[PDB]
Design a protein around this ligand. Sequence first.
Ligand SMILES: O=C(O)[C@@H](O)[C@H](O)[C@H](O)C(=O)NO
Ligand SMILES: O=C(O)[C@@H](O)[C@H](O)[C@H](O)C(=O)NO
Ligand SMILES: O=C(O)[C@@H](O)[C@H](O)[C@H](O)C(=O)NO
Ligand SMILES: [Cl-]
Ligand SMILES: [Zn+2]
Ligand SMILES: [Zn+2]
Ligand SMILES: [Zn+2]
Ligand SMILES: [Zn+2]
Lengths: 409, 409, 409
Amino acid sequence: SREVLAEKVKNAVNNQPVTDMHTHLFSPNFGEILLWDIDELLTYHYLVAEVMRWTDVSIEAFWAMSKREQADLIWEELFIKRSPVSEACRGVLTCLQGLGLDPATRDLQVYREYFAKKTSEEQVDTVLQLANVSDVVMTNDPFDDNERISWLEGKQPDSRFHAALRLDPLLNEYEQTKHRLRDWGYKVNDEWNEGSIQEVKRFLTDWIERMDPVYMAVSLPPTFSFPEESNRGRIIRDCLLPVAEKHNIPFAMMIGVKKRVHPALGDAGDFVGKASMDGVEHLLREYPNNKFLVTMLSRENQHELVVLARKFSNLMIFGCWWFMNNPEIINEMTRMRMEMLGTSFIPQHSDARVLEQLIYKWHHSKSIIAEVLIDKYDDILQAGWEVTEEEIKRDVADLFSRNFWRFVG
Amino acid sequence: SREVLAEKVKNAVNNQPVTDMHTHLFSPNFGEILLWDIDELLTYHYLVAEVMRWTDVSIEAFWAMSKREQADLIWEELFIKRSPVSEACRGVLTCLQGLGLDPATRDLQVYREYFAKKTSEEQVDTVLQLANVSDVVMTNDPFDDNERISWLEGKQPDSRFHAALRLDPLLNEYEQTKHRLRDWGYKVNDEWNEGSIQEVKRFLTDWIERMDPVYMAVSLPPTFSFPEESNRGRIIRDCLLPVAEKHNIPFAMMIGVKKRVHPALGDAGDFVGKASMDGVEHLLREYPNNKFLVTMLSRENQHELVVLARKFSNLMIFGCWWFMNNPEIINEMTRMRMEMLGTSFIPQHSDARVLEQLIYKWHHSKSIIAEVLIDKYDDILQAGWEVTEEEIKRDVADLFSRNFWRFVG
Amino acid sequence: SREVLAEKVKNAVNNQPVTDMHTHLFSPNFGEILLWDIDELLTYHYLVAEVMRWTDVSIEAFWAMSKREQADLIWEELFIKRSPVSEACRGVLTCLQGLGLDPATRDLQVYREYFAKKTSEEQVDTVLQLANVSDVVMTNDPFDDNERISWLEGKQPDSRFHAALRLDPLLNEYEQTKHRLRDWGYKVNDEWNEGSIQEVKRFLTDWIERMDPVYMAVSLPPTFSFPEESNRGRIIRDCLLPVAEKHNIPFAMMIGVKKRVHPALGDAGDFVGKASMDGVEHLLREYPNNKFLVTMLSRENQHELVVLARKFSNLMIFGCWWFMNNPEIINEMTRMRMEMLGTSFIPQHSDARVLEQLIYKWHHSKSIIAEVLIDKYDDILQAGWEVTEEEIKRDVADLFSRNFWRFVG
Ligand SMILES: O=C(O)[C@@H](O)[C@H](O)[C@H](O)C(=O)NO
Ligand SMILES: O=C(O)[C@@H](O)[C@H](O)[C@H](O)C(=O)NO
Ligand SMILES: O=C(O)[C@@H](O)[C@H](O)[C@H](O)C(=O)NO
Ligand SMILES: [Cl-]
Ligand SMILES: [Zn+2]
Ligand SMILES: [Zn+2]
Ligand SMILES: [Zn+2]
Ligand SMILES: [Zn+2]
């Protein structure tokens, strides 16, 4: 009867349309910022870091190569010279097979043919159908010249794509960012006074109006603290929180990233650190009318984060972020979470940078989540409880989609 | 032959009478402080925290409801609207089934009937028989007005119940507690001098004489330190340790709890934090004639605690406490412990607040411990070693009962 | 087809000759420092710590017993009075069975007979053949009077044994060690100046020339930091690194050991602590022309160490050291590592102190690594990838031998 349960859980999980609440994808009409195709998959920064542990090619020479050459190098170094057993390499193969291509031939030239004959709009339809993803939440940074243009030009995203206002430059680099704000018309002063406060709010409000984001977000360092008499502390306290409450918009904090420990690696140069929970605890307790979405980078912060979620209902924890996005960790995190929170959390997000990743990110995660659900349902079944297929579909819907939409309101 | 071993290990584990060395239960003759019945199980604070993550009912409104209404709300929110897959919810079902009730009907009114027709004394006999628990260690706090009365009135606990002198108010709130001591006749001065020292010892000795506790205990914060020029540091050094050595009574320290991070939740408002091992290390090494029972709340303290037990024989680690009491964690902790300590530790305690919890707490934990034992016995069996059924029963007896009684002496 | 894969992975793993890159063994011709036989196995410090948690025999009385008596005590306490389920006890049995002895008889006197009729050279041939170990890396400390003699007398180690220059006394006890250096002719001054710098380099160079080590090593405390204006910080910066770069010799750092928390236990008296990654991060980034071999003692440092390896190619992480060398931990560590690094790491080393341990250390670890490999190969097989037996043998060769030799150059 566990196998009967297993088949129903797996079916429910596989058929449930997914709302990916955090990615780095863009509506196809936004242009080239939407990365896709086998060359992009292979040049994903997760693989750049991995190839540099093997190749004799210098990092400078690598960045000088064309994307085709980088992709050929990574394919040779990580798939041919050594078996592609890492999670990221495994992911590439899963994407290929899911698209109908054959990893058995190891024919990179043939795989490339598949992508060259399609348009971005077509590949988006293909991938979302294969990955069974109904909604994608973008990461939209108004401080990026390329992204900003699209929004200013009035471009509205595809109905399947949702905006999220990323604020890293504002919160973590205010000393430099303030000057850009001034150039844009927001009259922030040198001192943090009523004027600076109101203009920063104006800036946030203008972009909220323009993007209609499901939430505002920021990635924070292991040393994150709050309250704090710093630009970040003051902006969060005097501008972000008040504005988020007014529009009832959740604040997402991705905590634990130590930026650029290896600058030459670019996007692959970030490290991780354990953070104190004090700041998050204070925010949750002192701002009960604000909603917070949180995910942490350190493996050592995971359990206490689950416990904090038991304390505050205005906290919704989500995903297995970045360095946590590996089977061994996803499994332990998801089990600890269901054990202490039942179904009141968002188990995963893809964080996809390349369109096709939605296939492997969700395929790999769904199989793990399905196994966890099967164990948990079986435990209560052995206790005499009877679970209906509709209750399973309901639970699965909450985990992969409803909890998020319900939280953002 | 692994299945032959499995059946013997499981049989031995299930038939071994358990000594629960830490609970919040009371001898039935102590009165109403002994909580029991389906309504109490459902209003366990672990479930209050969980229901607050789902219900639209305010925490104030919840505390205003009758226990019957709270129980109905929790049943509806956590068992009916979503599958009861969390560890605490699973536990309720296990208790129901163990009592002969049927979770399949989901008939809360029928379950309530079972409890209304029995006396506390009868339910105690029923539960201890079902849970196969021979001895229960209570948590007796002389600073609680309700508990204190029973002891002062000369009430002696049931032979199956043992006393443990809880000292949180004395050690963590001396500034306020000192005044109560004075009102009780213990002449502690404003300054920590010979007089204050002797009167605190007198207080401890009087209660040791009155309760005849198996150990003195205290829960400590993540910031716990020792030695320390504070009330706690001085009381432990000048009073607790000397008195514990004289009567050869162990000192139990439950470390890592951060009290009231969410006051409105009451008992469900405590958080957790990783502690430094420095204080425990110092205590173990500098007080070789004292015995220490230790359990920690942070997942990140578990492995180093096991290593410290390898260093000092006056340290006996026990259980998977509170936020650690979940399958995923219990499994990892128990395996790390057996691997580095063999059978020289106490794997679990229930921490039961409601009588019936003894059923699920021990049922859930025993099945995990049995699987760990089976793996470990199988590994040495494959090495050519032959384990007899009597040796298995012996090992199981040490884990679930003898190690504790042997340690407390 | 998973079983077909399983048989090939297991075969490849078992047949792959192992290069043990860190042990405390010595070439047989070096003399008595090479410990071997059943009495040594039983008196391994891991077991001394374990027996002290059970026996009523004082630690002083234990150290006063002959090695035969200590071995009899440990056998009685840990194998007869309680089942030998701990990892270290399990290891002893694995060694016995591997040598052809029968753990079923529990006849210690008979086992002893096997060893008394052989020479060290013969047992070395026997063990290395059984453990399938082709190369052993020793730990050679020039500050030890016993070891130093052999080297000064011109003794060259067996071709299967390689030297590693251990520098703990120099780096962690310079204030005392400096005086010994002077007595040996190295004119280090009271102040850290050009003269002291050059003489410390001379000392390192002389021993590098004499030992021809594959790397220089040191064990460091949880509080390790760098850069640092201390003897250790200055010696590493001004002498060790420059010299290691010139001879292209890797620097091995075993971090997280807190020495002598329980002095009376001798070698069994060391504890563990979580370290900051700051020092390692700085060393890797600021000294790109230097190579670093790193292993950490704290379970809480493992994941971030893997992430740091993704950042820097001059970092090669290795093994599951000491308190990490237990199935539960080895399994989680190895899976996290393969998931984020593929095959670019050294999964294990034995750290053997007694010759026969090579049998169980490698037997226990190989079975775990084999299971991890099987899961990872199966995941990509399910993705459509086809792995050849030769590619498996290749991958296995990198993990157990080639990655190390390639890194040391
Ligand atoms: O949102 C973030 O800051 C991260 O997720 C980064 O995009 C990171 O580099 C990444 O690729 N995802 O994990
Ligand atoms: O003894 C303690 O301090 C804890 O166990 C508390 O009673 C806690 O609230 C609880 O219910 N048990 O984990
Ligand atoms: O090399 C080291 O410092 C350690 O490995 C010690 O030798 C330790 O005591 C041991 O036996 N190995 O883990
Ligand atoms: Cl930690
Ligand atoms: Zn695990
Ligand atoms: Zn992201
Ligand atoms: Zn308790
Ligand atoms: Zn070693």
